Amino acid sequence: RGEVEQMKSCLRVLSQPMPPTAGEAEQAADQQEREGALELLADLCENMDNAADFCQLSGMHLLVGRYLEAGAAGLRWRAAQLIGTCSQNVAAIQEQVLGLGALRKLLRLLDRDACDTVRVKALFAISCLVREQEAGLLQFLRLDGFSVLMRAMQQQVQKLKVKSAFLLQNLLVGHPEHKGTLCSMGMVQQLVALVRTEHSPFHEHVLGALCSLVTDFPQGVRECREPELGLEELLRHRCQLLQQHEEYQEELEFCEKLLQTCFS
Numbered sequence: 001r002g003e004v005e006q007m008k009s010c011l012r013v014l015s016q017p018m019p020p021t022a023g024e025a026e027q028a029a030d031q032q033e034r035e036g037a038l039e040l041l042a043d044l045c046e047n048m049d050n051a052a053d054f055c056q057l058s059g060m061h062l063l064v065g066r067y068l069e070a071g072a073a074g075l076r077w078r079a080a081q082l083i084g085t086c087s088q089n090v091a092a093i094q095e096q097v098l099g100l101g102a103l104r105k106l107l108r109l110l111d112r113d114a115c116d117t118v119r120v121k122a123l124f125a126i127s128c129l130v131r132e133q134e135a136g137l138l139q140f141l142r143l144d145g146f147s148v149l150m151r152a153m154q155q156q157v158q159k160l161k162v163k164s165a166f167l168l169q170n171l172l173v174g175h176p177e178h179k180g181t182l183c184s185m186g187m188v189q190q191l192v193a194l195v196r197t198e199h200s201p202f203h204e205h206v207l208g209a210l211c212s213l214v215t216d217f218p219q220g221v222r223e224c225r226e227p228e229l230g231l232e233e234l235l236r237h238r239c240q241l242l243q244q245h246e247e248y249q250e251e252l253e254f255c256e257k258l259l260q261t262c263f264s
Contacts, residue, residue, distance in 0.1 A: 007044055007054060010037040014062055031072050038067070038078035042085055051086040051093060060086070060097050068105040073115035080109060080121035088128040098129055098136045104143055111148045116157050123152070123160065127167050137175055146182060150190050153202065165194075165205035172212035179217045188213060188223035192231050199241065207238075207254035214261045224262040232263045 014037050019030050041059070044050040054060070060083065067079035083102060087093045102125070109122035126145070130136045140146075152164035172179070191213075194206045213220035224231050235255045242248040242255070 010041045013037040035074050042082050045086045064100045064102045073118050077118040077121040080125045084125040084128045094133050107148050162202040165202045169205040169208040172209050183219045204251040211254045235259050
């Protein structure tokens with residue numbers, strides 16, 4: 001194979017201290033070598049057993065402890081990506097990564113990072129940790145993760161807005177016990193504001209999320225019916241805009257369900 005040795009060699013590169021006094025060429029070479037190590041680890045860690053071996057070698061300790069807060073964006077995003085790759089398919093690794101305080105650091109990257117690729121990979125990592133994990137989602141909530149997702153849907157870069165909205169929709173389907181909290185947090189209002197923006201692909205997920213919040217949930221219905229929100233007007237205009245087009249059928253179905261559920 002040669003895979004255990006690659007993995008150990010890569011961890012040795014990544015375990016080295018940042019070079020002390022360094023000129024620009026030394027610093028740039030050093031960063032490329034660490035980037036390459038993370039990439040080679042990612043290749044290995046698509047396999048679930050490699051992923052587990054990686055964790056057994058305390059790789060997640062190193063990524064969470066040092067690389068999510070590395071100076072260079074290229075290290076941060078590759079670190080976030082590798083966390084997601086390893087944890088995506090393995091419940092045991094999800095739990096280990098959560099116990100290492102990864103979520104607080106990932107949310108900070110998603111919410112604040114100057115580099116968009118870091119944000120996207122952070123969101124990927126978060127999605128892997130939180131979707132099939134009741135404890136990870138509880139912690140996500142406690143860490144104000146739904147507000148982080150909301151600000152991601154509110155900012156400009158379309159890739160992040162679609163992926164954030166997609167995650168919110170998924171969490172609401174998978175975890176309906178949280179509709180109350182989300183409604184009380186004023187998510188109906190914040191989601192409906194997103195529906196007011198220029199029609200685009202993330203709208204489908206936004207309206208899917210709203211659908212979850214009203215489905216068998218009187219508080220969601222009440223919020224949707226609030227006179228100032230103006231949601232009926234919005235939904236009826238959206239229905240007429242989408243109704244002849246086969247490729248918006250799912251967003252249209254969400255609008256229709258909201259109209260049925262909330263407005264006779």
